[PDB]
C-alpha cells in the first residue's frame, strides 16, 4: 500500500514543483527578452542620432554657402541696370527705375502700366 | 506717345 | 528515507528542466533581438532618407526665393557707393542714396567717367 | 565740378 503511495507521492511532487519552476523560467525569459530589446533599442537609436545630425550638419553648412552665393549675386545686381520688362540687362534708357533690353520690351512694359507713369521729358 | 529710345 | 528520494529526483529533474528551458530563452532572446535590429534598419534608413529629400526641397524653397529677390533687386536703384537703395540720380547706372556717398564715389573715381550733363 | 544732384523718387 505504501509501494504505491510513495509512488504517487514523489509523482505530485515532481509536478508542481515542475510547474513552478516552470512559470519561473517563463517570465525570467520574458525579461531577458525585455532587458535584450531594450539595450539593442538605445544602441540603435544612439547610432542613428549620430549619423542623422552629421548630415543635419551638412546640410546647415551647404545652406550657410547658398546665403553666401546669394549675397554675392545680390551685390552684382545692384552693380547693373536691368530691363523692366523681361530681366535681361539693359541697353536703353527710359527714365527713373526704367530701362529697356529692347525695343519690344519697351512697347510691352508701356502699353502694361508704363503709358501711365513715364516721367521722361 | 511712346518716347523714341536710343542705346545708352 | 522517502523524502531522500523524492528530494533527489525532484531536485534533479529541476535542474535538467532549468537546462533547457534557458536553451528556450537563449533562443527566444537571439529572435527578438534579430527581430528588432532588422526593423530598427527599415526604420533608420526610411527617417534618413525623409531627412534628406527634405534638405532637398528646403535647397529649393531657398533657391525659389533667392530668384524673387533678385527680381525685385533688378526693379530697384541701388546707391553705387554702398549698395543701399539710391535716392539721387547721376547719369547711366550710376545713382546714389546719399551726397556724402556721391562726392567719396566722385572724388574716388567717377569724376573720369560720369556720363552726365 | 561735381554735379548737384537733385532728388528723384
Ligand atoms: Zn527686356
Ligand atoms: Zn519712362
Ligand atoms: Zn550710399
Ligand atoms: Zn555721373
Known sequence: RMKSDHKRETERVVREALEKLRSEMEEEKRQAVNKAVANMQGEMDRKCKQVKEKCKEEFVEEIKKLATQHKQLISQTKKKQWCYNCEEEAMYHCCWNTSYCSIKCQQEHWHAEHKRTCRRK | ?8
Do not use: A, D, Y
Not at chain 2, 1 to 8: A, G
Open chain 2, 1 to 8: 506717345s511712346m518716347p523714341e529710345l536710343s542705346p545708352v
